[PDB]
Symmetry: D2
Subunit: 236 residues, 4 copies
Amino acid sequence: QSMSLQGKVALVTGASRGIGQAIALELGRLGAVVIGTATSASGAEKIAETLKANGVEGAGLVLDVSSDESVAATLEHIQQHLGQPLIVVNNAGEWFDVVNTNLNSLYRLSKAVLRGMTKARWGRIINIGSVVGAMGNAGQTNYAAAKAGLEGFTRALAREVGSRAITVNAVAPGFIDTDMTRELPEAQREALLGQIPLGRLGQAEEIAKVVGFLASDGAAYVTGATVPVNGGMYMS
Amino acid sequence: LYFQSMSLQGKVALVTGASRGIGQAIALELGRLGAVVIGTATSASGAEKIAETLKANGVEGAGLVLDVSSDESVAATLEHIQQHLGQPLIVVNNAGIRMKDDEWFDVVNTNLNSLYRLSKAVLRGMTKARWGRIINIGSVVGAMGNAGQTNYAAAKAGLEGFTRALAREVGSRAITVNAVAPGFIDTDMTRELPEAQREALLGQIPLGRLGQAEEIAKVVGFLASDGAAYVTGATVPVNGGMYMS
Amino acid sequence: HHSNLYFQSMSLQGKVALVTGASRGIGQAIALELGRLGAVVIGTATSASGAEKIAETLKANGVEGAGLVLDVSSDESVAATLEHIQQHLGQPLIVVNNAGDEWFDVVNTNLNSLYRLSKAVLRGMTKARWGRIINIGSVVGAGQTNYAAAKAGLEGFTRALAREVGSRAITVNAVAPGFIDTDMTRELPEAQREALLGQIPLGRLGQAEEIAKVVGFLASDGAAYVTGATVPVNGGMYMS
Amino acid sequence: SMSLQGKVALVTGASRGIGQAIALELGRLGAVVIGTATSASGAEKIAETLKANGVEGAGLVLDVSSDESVAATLEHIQQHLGQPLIVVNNAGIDEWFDVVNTNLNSLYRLSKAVLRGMTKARWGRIINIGSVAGQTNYAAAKAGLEGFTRALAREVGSRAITVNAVAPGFIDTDMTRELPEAQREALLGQIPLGRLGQAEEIAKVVGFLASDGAAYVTGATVPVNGGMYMS
Ligand SMILES: Nc1nc(-c2ccccc2)cn1NC(=O)Nc1ccccc1F
Ligand SMILES: Nc1nc(-c2ccccc2)cn1NC(=O)Nc1ccccc1F
């Protein structure tokens, strides 16, 4: 009668900063045991501090989602130590190659965690889209493309794994206040505020709450869906 | 002076079409989250029933008679609420008013005129408070034929473009506007068409089951929260993986 | 009410086409294109001088047809107009709707007009067991809210109507123009035009004719299996 | 004014069905047409069909999954018939993912290879034909085709090159002719037009998209499905 993720293990890729960090803390707040990942040892260490610092049981690991070996080994380490990850949030990220590489990483990781979810006959996979913030024309092409790829992928994977009570969903952030976007040139940021009906940048936490909800038992009938979290700014 | 993640304490919510099924489940969910809940129906016995259900589940609120097709009804109803309980800052439109692939136009036209009516009327209150949630519930799947698809696809497309457009119009005032597009939900309609044809429905749904009314309500419950503040103009499908447009 | 070279393009020979809002721009271009393809063309406008002008343009480009006064918002106008056409020129089997808190009322009013007119021409197409209905969208023109909405409305409508009339071999389609060269857009300050062109991959405004060719195609027998579709004609500029 | 006289068109997977119909339609419009197939007997057949319908062109062996095949094939065309400015990708190829990933890698391979020619001529048409268990794979292939087509259109647009897709519904082809009557009729029952589409009816759309009249259409995916939409 609640959104408690007590007893569940969650894996959040790219958790050392920004959105991923905010997602790790939110799932922690909800009672999940949280494994966050980064590509470096110091990133993984930092994830661990942040967890203790906010009273979250879990760990930081080194993970490169572009390589089969890293993925296989990492998942093994988790299984042997903390249990099977039943919540998995892919947040660790020229148009063609970017999208092709991202989606190969989603599929890789998703397929690897699926054996565990299948066995438990329950699971949540949640895919975070790229943030809006794209120095140029290139960057609109790239965001629209990444979004279309995420959506069709998420929908297709949901249909494939649905019969096992595993939901698969995506979250498509708009213009979010992050360490990356605070660095954009003022003209570019203001031109983006001018496009957003809510008249402000979204917070990382505001992405994390959606992920938090999608991970809950309450969201059990939501699958193959891509939830936009963009303040009313839609770009396609 | 309180503050927690999903609370709606201190907020007044208005849920149209709350006497049964989805709307009832929504009223109880917003109640469960601490909202003062006004549910509505088109009849006195419906409104009575809403009130019983609230008290019976310990929810502070009321049942009112409301016809969303009529300006007078809407104006008067909102007045009563303002006079007595305060300003409704959460508003969930769920009162949509043998069917064939030609009835689509009128159904959708009538629904959307009612959304706009009610929405515009509650907007003055939300504007004044510089905060608000409007949530629009789509039609469930009401017939499994061609007739039934045309109508569901159409109702969905209309709801989505409407919700998006309205979100853009009111966004600058910190008012989110969202929709929920239920798929095949366990309700009065779905239960009574015998199974050999109904069971064929489960085969179209990857989750392999009908959705529960509660499962729509949790989504509405989330969208109404402060956590969902950056979600606007969105239509959340809640269909077990069955997508049709 | 104002009314031997065999060109090869003349594939809509023998068909009567009705193009609403034909006195200028896109609608005018559509009337001449369907004319070019051999259709007998009735174009419409809301005023007598508009209808006069349509007729001049037709004769001036050697198109058999007429200019009529039509108000698509009124049942009487529609019924009477269609009857005049039936009694004089035959049954219109190709029909192109191009004649158009603001955000809601615009879309609601348009779609009520589409449905009115569409339902009225449908008896004729049903009897002939063939027909083309083509709906021209809102061009670009606060303007962002309205364009996405108008588009979503047009598209769901077009799709739903296609499903309803399909069994009778009547296609129903829409065309969603992007930024089209019209007499208003030619007058922007260079900075404004260049900034708009910078959003369009083709790097130019579309021509009215370029909308008309799509309509021309959709009207043909070749497009018989295309129905409930909305064809964007925007130079690669997609707004949501 | 639908003419393609003087233009060279390349149609992959042209030995039968849709691709064949596309090759004859672009031929009918005056294009010099190179059709392709994966086998020698397929390529021969393409050539017979062209001569048999008075179309100037050729049948070539092409495997769009291989860089070498593509590079060599395009060279042969450049050296013999000129630069292909109209290009229609119709040769299609845990199963959903790989299908779509492989198809889109083939589109991108071929597209990039023909793009040099179009850039040089400052004009071009690229048209991608979609696929004709089964919903997951169709919805996925479609979503991939659409986003791809749109993204590529944005990239090459400034050079007066349109890039578009055609998403056929249920078409009368060698696959569909094999279904049991109850199953096909249940499929007709989902199609408002009440019939299967013809290959020619896909081809006319391609024919139109290739024309100068369609110059302002780019990044678009035209459904050709008799009113049956599955997503
Ligand atoms: N390799 C690749 N490129 C793209 C793509 C590029 C631009 C826009 C949209 C998709 C998508 N993908 N996607 C895939 O590999 N798989 C994929 C794409 C869409 C739906 C389902 C899929 F599996
Ligand atoms: N009369 C009508 N029909 C439809 C419609 C029909 C089929 C699919 C989608 C919308 C919508 N509407 N009415 C509206 O007032 N507005 C409207 C429709 C679609 C999107 C946005 C809108 F404001």
